Amino acid sequence: MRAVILVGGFGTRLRPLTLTTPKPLVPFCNKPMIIHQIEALKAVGVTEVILAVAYRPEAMKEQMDEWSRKLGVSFVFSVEEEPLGTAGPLALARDILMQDDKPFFVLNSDVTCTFPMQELLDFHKAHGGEGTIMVVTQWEKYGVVVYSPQNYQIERFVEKPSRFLGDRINAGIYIFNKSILDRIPPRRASIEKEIFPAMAAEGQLEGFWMDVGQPKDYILGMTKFIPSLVHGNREHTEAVEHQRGGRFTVIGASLIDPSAKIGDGAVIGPYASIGANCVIGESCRIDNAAILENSKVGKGTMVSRSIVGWNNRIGSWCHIKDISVLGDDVEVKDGVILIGTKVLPNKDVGEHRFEPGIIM
């Protein structure tokens, strides 16, 4: 009946875009990352969502703008505890308890997946079935390796193992009962306070899944996510949008906001997202690239596998390839080639850069 979407965090990995907005609020395809999770929660039975915001309490205005659909007015913060925010639910143990006794969801704000949120009780084991489902199944470099047998028990929980195998990792979606928030409230920073050794049953994804918190991870998660969205959003059959401006061709599926304008002959490539009010030149190539909002693009650029930030002004014949994240209000001169270079907000690029790097 309640959920705790952890939104407090510096977003260091997604830095060029998170210097302006918090990581929950940077759009993934056409909506902020938290908005997908909030919509899934609205689909399942829940009304009030509490947010533990630490990095920037200025997200309140944007949440109020998005407050129309759901009662996500709750906001709590006293002092920076941790981006992981284990004390997050513990620092607000009073609100979750007295209002209701139902189990409460806990989610990361940078996770995208099918979002099952099944109405099935699954009361024999709360987090074992959900989160990392047992047949997640990816590299062990990031995320905690979870060792679960066929009987749905968790024995080992190592946040960043060096080399321990165990391709299974937690999805980032947790469901907890009222005992967890009253179990270990140490009143200070901690890491998820997982005490799975003590218990095996009820004490507490068959689908795509990706931790969308890194630029390359952002691109790959968008690539995995757009095909799964073809069923619901806007259902000319090659992609979601195929005729918005002039006459352009689309290869594969893509998300184009009806407010955007596309030039004559642009080739919106596979798994590309175009934001609101964005303008695309005559013969651009948007190949697995995300255009956030209000960005303008000249005639013939090839933004491929990279991210173009808000209010950008891309030149006429640029080439923004590789994984090169552009910040807010970045202007690129004509003919500039950017390959894997991250540009901080409010910068002008006029020189070529053929190697990965940072532009101050």
Ligand X SMILES: Nc1nc2c(ncn2[C@@H]2O[C@H](COP(=O)(O)OP(=O)(O)O[C@H]3O[C@H](CO)[C@@H](O)[C@H](O)[C@@H]3O)[C@@H](O)[C@H]2O)c(=O)[nH]1
* Residue 63 to residue 73: CA distance in whole angstroms: 8
Q: Which of 102, 141, 160, 216 is catalytic?
A: 160
* Residue 59 to residue 77: CA distance in whole angstroms: 12
169 scored as a contact of ligand X (CB under 6 A): yes
Question: Which CB sits closer to its own copies, 18 or 301?
Answer: 18
CB of 32 to Mg ion, least distance (A): 15
Using the rule CB under 5 A, which residue among 48, 82, 110, 217 binds Mg ion?
A: 110
284 scored as a contact of ligand X (CB under 6 A): no
As for the chain, the residues directly before each break of C–N over 2.5 Å are: 135, 204, 235
Helix (H, G, I), strand (E, B) or coil at 83: coil
In the numeric block, which tokens belong to residue 321?
């390839």
110 scored as a contact of ligand X (CB under 6 A): yes
- The yes-or-no answer on residue 70 being catalytic is no
Size of interface with its own copies, in residues (CB under 8 A): 12
328 scored as a contact of Mg ion (CB under 5 A): no
Question: 308: closest CA among 288, 283, 280, 328?
Answer: 328
Between the CA atoms of 188, 17, 145 and 150, what dihedral angle is there, to the nearest 10 degrees?
Answer: 110
Scanning 38-46, 138-146, 191-199, 342-350 for contacts with its own copies by CB under 8 A, the matching segment is: 342-350
Question: 72: closest CA among 18, 114, 34, 30?
Answer: 34
Give the CA distances from residue 31 to residues 65, 296, 315, in Å, rounded to whole numbers and listed in that order. Answer: 13, 19, 26
Question: 338: closest CA among 352, 323, 350?
Answer: 352
Using the rule CB under 8 A, which residue among 206, 346, 350, 354 binds its own copies?
A: 346
Question: Which CB sits closer to Mg ion, 130 or 257?
Answer: 130
**Per-residue interface string for the shown chain with ligand X, residues 34-53, x marking contact by CB under 6 A:** --------------------
106 scored as a contact of ligand X (CB under 6 A): no
> H or E element: which one contains 339?
strand 337-339
Angle at the Cα of 29 from the Cα atoms of 45 and 311, rounded to 5 degrees: 125
10 scored as a contact of its own copies (CB under 8 A): yes
Residue type, 129: G
170 scored as a contact of ligand X (CB under 6 A): yes
Pick from Mg ion, ligand X, its own copies, none: which does 7 bind, CB < 5 to 8 A by kind? ligand X
82 scored as a contact of Mg ion (CB under 5 A): no
Pick from Mg ion, its own copies, ligand X, none: which does 357 bind, CB < 5 to 8 A by kind? its own copies
19 scored as a contact of its own copies (CB under 8 A): yes
* Residue 214 to residue 145: CA distance in whole angstroms: 19
In the numeric block, which tokens belong to residue 109?
């704000």
Using the rule CB under 8 A, which residue among 197, 246, 350, 357 binds its own copies?
A: 357
71 scored as a contact of its own copies (CB under 8 A): no
Question: 26: closest CA among 214, 262, 297, 248?
Answer: 214
List interacting residues with its own copies (CB under 8 A).
10, 12, 15, 19, 342, 344-347, 357-358, 360
List interacting residues with ligand X (CB under 6 A).
6-13, 22-24, 55, 83-84, 108-111, 142-144, 159, 169-170, 172, 211, 213
List interacting residues with Mg ion (CB under 5 A).
110, 211, 213
List, by residue number, the catalytic residues.
160
